[PDB]
Copies of this chain bind each other. A is one copy, B any other.
Amino acid sequence: NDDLWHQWKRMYNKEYNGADDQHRRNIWEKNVKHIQEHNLRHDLGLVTYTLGLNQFTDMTFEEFKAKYLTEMSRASDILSHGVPYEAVPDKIDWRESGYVTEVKDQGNCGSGWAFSTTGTMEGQYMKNERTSISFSEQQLVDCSRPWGNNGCGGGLMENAYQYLKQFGLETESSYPYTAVEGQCRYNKQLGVAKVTGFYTVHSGSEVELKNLVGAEGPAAVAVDVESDFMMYRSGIYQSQTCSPLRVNHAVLAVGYGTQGGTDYWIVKNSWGLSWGERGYIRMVRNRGNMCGIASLASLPMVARFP
């Protein structure tokens, strides 16, 4: 694996001091052994997804979790501060409508919640205005602490929506992403979009989530990320150990479909295109609210700011 370690480090621009290189190699090797074992089971049809190398392969899951993941759900969620959602196609992929921006990269920051927010906002704005937009995650990271968010330490899309009822969301061009929380640089003159209300699906109902996505557009969701999620490469992800109460990272449900009998969600992540299926994960659908996808879902109603 010597050859491959050096190539992997080049691919992801990883550079370590003498104190770290061997420990990182050891983690990488352990992870690689798991990927190789898992993937042979896939070839025999014993699991429905594969694992792969990516920018996280030299991390332990506990390290990853400390950096990127935080418990997002509370029992309080049962009754949302939006409108709970209750005649749609059997399959849909809002990428095909032009309503989804390319996959972004949150970098060294636990800011998935901010990408999920901007992604659902992008979907609505592009649909309603028939034009391209990409919104600022950095604005959310830097400016929404008073609404209960914690920057790179985590947050909630529904908290961001409350912020965005009063303050207009800027474009990426106006307020670009740095992956470091800084002082709020909100400029009212550059606000483009605001939230007027939002729909929720917090019930665990995958039918309700399908209805929301199929009628309205890409929905913000949170999921329970485990080690195999960190390492996911392709196929339909499933877990027997995840919990719908332990959602800990936000993503974007852009569609749904079925492959060879097995229903799935199409989910956009913010870990770059090197993770998953060019940045996406297909997660099993209609199988127990897998990983809590229908436990913390939402979709804002968006208007021009003004």
Contact = CB atoms under 8 A, between A and B. Distances in A.
Nearest to A35: B40
Interface stretch (A41-49, A66-74, A207-215): A41-49
Interface stretch (A3-11, A133-141, A243-251): A3-11
A233 interface: yes
19 contacts: A4-B40, A4-B41, A4-B44, A7-B44, A7-B46, A8-B44, A11-B44, A11-B45, A32-B40, A35-B40, A36-B36, A36-B39, A36-B40, A39-B39, A40-B53, A43-B52, A43-B53, A43-B233, A44-B53
Contacts of A32: 40
For the complex of A and B, list the 4 residue pairs with the smallest distance between their C-beta atoms, beginning with the closest: A36-B36, A43-B53, A43-B52, A7-B44
Contacts of A35: 40
In this complex, the interface size class of chain A, counting residues with CB under 8 Å from chain B, is 10 to 19
A10 to B, nearest CB: 9
Contacts of A40: 4, 32, 35-36, 53
Interface string A11-54: 10000000000000000000010011001110111100000110
A64 to B, nearest CB: 19
Interface of A: 4, 7-8, 11, 32, 35-36, 39-41, 43-46, 52-53, 233
Contacts of A36: 36, 39-40
Contacts of A41: 4
Given A7-B46, A36-B39, 11 more contacts: A4-B40, A4-B41, A4-B44, A11-B44, A32-B40, A35-B40, A36-B36, A40-B53, A43-B52, A43-B53, A44-B53
A228 to B, nearest CB: 15
Contacts of A39: 36, 39
A200 B35 CA distance: 46
Contacts of A233: 43
A220 B46 CA distance: 36
Q: Which of the listed residues A32, A36, A41 has the most CB atoms from chain B within 10 Å of its own CB?
A: A36
A268 B53 CA distance: 31
A213 to B, nearest CB: 30
A115 to B, nearest CB: 25
A276 to B, nearest CB: 12
A11 to B, nearest CB: 6
A206 to B, nearest CB: 30
Nearest to A41: B4
A247 B35 CA distance: 36
Contacts of A45: 11
Nearest to A36: B36
Nearest to A12: B44
A36 B41 CA distance: 12
